[PDB]
Design goal:
GO terms for molecular function: ATP binding; ATP hydrolysis activity; catalytic activity, acting on a nucleic acid; DNA helicase activity; double-stranded RNA binding; G-quadruplex DNA binding; G-quadruplex RNA binding; histone deacetylase binding. The protein is α/β, with parallel strands linked by helices. Helices cover 45% and strands 16% of the residues.
RNA sequence: GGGGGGGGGGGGUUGUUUUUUU
């Protein structure tokens, strides 16, 4: 029975356990290096209100009222519902400090309210004292709104005109006074560093606050606690008419206004309606978290019988049978295929937009669709929409189609907010959306496919019915629809707060706990304590929650604190360019994209790009180097390279701009003596992959994994100190790699979807962990003489070598604190750079293999 | 635990939501 198997398994595990203490690396330096270290240790140890401007603005407004383009634009704008409330909106804003505006889809509140305020100020003779700033949650949204408003005003965007925008690394600044600026929310937070009061800003508008991102909440709290200091500033908040009362309550019951929307009628169908209408018969016959989740999940199964008999009277028996056999935790793509076939058979012309949770669902639905004979012809176009697919499909989705053909788009929630087709008539909404929750207890981030929210369902329904009446099919029964969450949980309760805590400390917003508690929907105390503990362990904050000199640079850097530490270390060790590229990739996406079908080829090309570095961080460096090399040969070679390795040119350009920004910040802080990341003086060690790996280890140290090379096949098992047994994601370049020189990996992203996965990994060498890791100890197990880092990263070494390494590590810690405290480029002429030079030499030369 | 048996089927399994920073 199980006894024999358990007895065999215990012995096998013991044999594997006994084999662990036979496979440790042998940290070993030669006699000459040890003598040099001994000598070095022994030696070293011993605005305003201008009237003429307002007059000119009024004269321009009067003279330009007769322009033909402006007349046409106002004829277009007249159709907007928000024009009917212009007098009410202006009076409400002018008579109260804070107002809340609720508008449905098509109300145009984004492009009209700011124009209303600016024009009203201009024609009253005080147009030189208006400075309106409207915040947007997306860069493309800000750009589009800015250009739309500028066109409505018959003026060019920016260029000294009234309207403009400013996003990261792109800005078209408008006039100093009497202007509208459509920036992202993150721009305003950067303003508070040097202008805490926003003295030049008279009106500030917070847009799309119904969806609760971190930056919007932080800015809202800052504005709330700043109003007492500025009695003349006016605040406008825009919501989506759902739970718009809570924002008014948060601001002391400020007046609230509502703009009716203007959308074509949309017919809504549920699962039972689809089953009854399309007569869907299942083909396969093989049908055989905490807190709020438990409740909803429970009431569902406390009424499940009671709800069911209500379908046995109005509807048919087949519908009830199919509903009964229906199962959650998945999206029935057979039902989607049957519904699509029904629509293409006897429904009128119109694009179909299907909302799916993940990429696997998109792939299997696309395969199911094109497996049939009818969809493989030229009378149907199927476009999958996903942020990881090449832009050639994003630019091919807006084009109108001939009336004979039909366009079917299978999309994630990107098409719900970012992509606006403005052509879809039929919408099929699988009620699944992927959400991420941060488990502070296990310090882990988890993804799962949860039921879509009420606001998300309303937005999906409103996606159709833009240019003509449309249909919305919902893949969940009425009981699920009525038992659905009103809003998605804000990311303030779903993300780590380390960067947020550093930003709070850099804005002089008082204590971290106090400011976080003053937030609406405040985070739990456990998350705040964990963030502060991580920051103090990182040595970014001292004991008394104050900004350590390293913490100042970390906070002023627009990245995560670990990424900022990596950037500082790269600037200090003169490997600036690869470290900056890796940091940009870690902060904002990887340049690799994947097209549908050709997915294995993508992984083959990715492994080709990684050469033999056994790391997915250096493959990004290789891809960036190849992309830069292709430019010097021409644009055609650039396109060919991006099409060969499945890269994203836009992402690569963005990464280049982020690298330039980091270099500019480092020059400002004084770490480097140049602004170009490619300056050789700051890129002495840029060609050494070992130094780059050491700097990566220095940046994200505590994220370390252990490899145990077993034998049957020669599989690899990866262990983590806190997460237990984990796995390497198939997207990684080390998922099928077995020739590992060292048994330690470094990772940045670790997420739990079905099993704990390390999305990016990098094989790292013992001296990197020795000189850039935790505490060092020198013990002796039985016979073996060992040196260990953090009591679990153990290496083999004699006592003398280990003690010299420990003393060298202490000396480098002191030197690093000195260098960070008073930044200055390191001069490599035998003065005090010997401490860093010897570790560079050790990492370069001493380590060869295991 | 293995491919010591077919004494059981007690253990052998699992790919990428969307965004943001003078």
């Amino acid at each position: 029975g199980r006894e024999i198997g358990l007895w065999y398994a215990k012995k096998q595990g013991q044999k594997n356990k006994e084999a662990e203490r036979q496979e440790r690396a042998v940290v070993h330096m030669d006699e000459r290096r040890e003598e040099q270290i001994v000598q070095l240790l022994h030696s070293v140890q011993t605005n305003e209100p201008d009237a003429t401007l307002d007059q000119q603005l009024l004269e321009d407004l009067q003279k330009k009222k007769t322009d033909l383009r402006y007349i046409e634009m106002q004829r277009f704008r007249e159709k907007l519902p928000s024009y009917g409330m212009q007098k009410e909106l202006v009076n409400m804003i002018d008579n109260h400090q804070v107002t809340v505006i609720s508008g449905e889809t098509g109300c145009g509140k984004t492009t009209q309210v700011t124009q209303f305020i600016l024009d009203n100020y201009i024609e009253r003779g005080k147009g030189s004292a208006c400075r309106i700033v409207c915040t947007q949650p997306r860069r493309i949204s800000a750009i589009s709104v800015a250009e739309r408003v500028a066109a409505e005003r018959a003026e060019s965007c920016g260029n000294g005109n009234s309207t403009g925008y400013q996003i990261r690394l792109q800005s078209r600044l408008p006039r100093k006074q009497g202007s509208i600026l459509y920036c992202t929310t993150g721009i305003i937070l950067q303003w508070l560093q040097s202008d805490p009061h926003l003295s030049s800003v008279s009106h500030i508008v917070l847009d799309e606050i119904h969806e609760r991102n971190l930056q919007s909440d932080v800015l809202m709290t800052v504005v709330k606690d700043l109003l007492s200091y500025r009695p003349d500033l006016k605040v406008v908040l825009m919501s989506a008419t759902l739970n718009a009362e809570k924002f008014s309550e948060y601001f002391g019951n400020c007046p609230m206004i509502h703009i009716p929307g203007f959308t074509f009628p949309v017919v809504e169908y549920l699962l039972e309606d689809i089953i009854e209408k399309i007569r869907y018969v299942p083909e396969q016959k093989e049908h055989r978290n905490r807190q709020e989740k438990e409740e909803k999940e429970a009431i569902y199964k406390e009424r499940w019988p009671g709800y069911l008999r209500e379908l046995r009277q109005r509807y048919s028996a087949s519908t009830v049978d199919v509903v009964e056999m229906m199962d959650d935790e998945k999206v029935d793509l057979n039902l989607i295929a049957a519904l699509i076939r029904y629509i293409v058979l006897e429904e009128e012309d119109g694009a179909i937009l299907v909302f799916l949770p993940g990429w696997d669902n998109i792939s299997t639905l696309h395969d199911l669709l094109m497996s049939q004979v009818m969809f493989k012809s030229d009378k149907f176009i199927i476009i999958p929409l996903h942020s990881l697919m090449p832009t050639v499909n994003q630019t091919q989705v807006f084009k109108r189609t001939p009336p004979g053909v039909r366009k079917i788009v299978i999309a994630t929630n990107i098409a719900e907010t970012s992509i606006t087709i403005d052509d879809v008539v039929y919408v099929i909404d699988g009620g699944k959306i992927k959400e991420t929750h941060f488990d502070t207890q296990n310090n882990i981030s988890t993804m799962s496919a949860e039921w879509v929210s009420k606001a998300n369902a309303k937005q999906r329904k409103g996606r159709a019915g833009r240019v003509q009446p449309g249909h919305c099919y919902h893949l969940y029964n009425s009981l699920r629809a009525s038992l659905l969450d009103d809003y998605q949980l804000p990311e303030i309760l779903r993300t780590p707060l380390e960067e947020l805590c550093l930003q709070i400390k850099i804005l002089r917003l008082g204590g971290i706990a106090h400011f976080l508690s003053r937030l609406m929907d405040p985070p739990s105390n456990e998350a705040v304590l964990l963030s502060i503990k991580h920051l103090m362990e990182l040595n970014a904050l001292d004991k008394q929650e104050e900004l350590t000199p390293l913490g100042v640079h970390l906070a002023r850097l627009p990245v995560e604190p670990h990424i900022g530490k990596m950037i500082l270390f790269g600037a200090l060790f003169c490997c600036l360019d690869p470290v900056l590229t890796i940091a940009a990739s870690l902060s904002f996406k990887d340049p690799f994209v994947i097209p549908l079908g050709k997915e294995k080829v993508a992984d083959a090309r990715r492994k080709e790009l990684a050469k033999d570095t056994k790391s997915d961080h250096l493959t990004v460096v290789n891809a960036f180097k190849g992309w830069e090399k292709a430019k010097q040969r021409g644009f055609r070679y650039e396109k060919d390279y991006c099409w060969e390795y499945f890269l994203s040119s836009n992402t690569l350009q963005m990464l280049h701009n982020m690298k330039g920004q980091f270099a500019e910040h480092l020059l400002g802080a004084g770490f480097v003596s140049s602004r170009n990341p490619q300056d050789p003086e700051s890129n002495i060690n840029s060609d050494n992959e070992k130094i780059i790996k050491a700097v990566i280890c220095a940046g994200l140290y505590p994220k370390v994994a252990k490899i145990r090379l077993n034998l049957g096949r020669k599989m690899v098992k990866v262990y983590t100190k806190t997460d237990g047994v984990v796995a390497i994601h198939p997207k990684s370049v080390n998922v099928e790699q077995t020739e590992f020189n060292y048994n330690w990996l470094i990772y940045h992203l670790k997420m739990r979807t079905s099993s704990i996965y390390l999305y990016d990994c990098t094989e790292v060498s013992p001296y990197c962990l020795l000189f850039f890791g935790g505490d060092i100890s020198i013990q002796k197990d039985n016979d073996q003489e060992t040196i260990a880092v953090d009591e679990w990263i153990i290496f083999q070494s004699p006592a003398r070598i280990a003690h010299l390494v420990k003393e060298l590590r202490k000396e480098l810690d002191i030197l690093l604190q000195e260098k960070i405290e008073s930044p200055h480029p390191v001069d490599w002429k035998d003065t005090k750079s010997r401490d860093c030079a010897v570790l560079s030499a050790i990492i370069d030369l001493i380590k060869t293999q295991e």
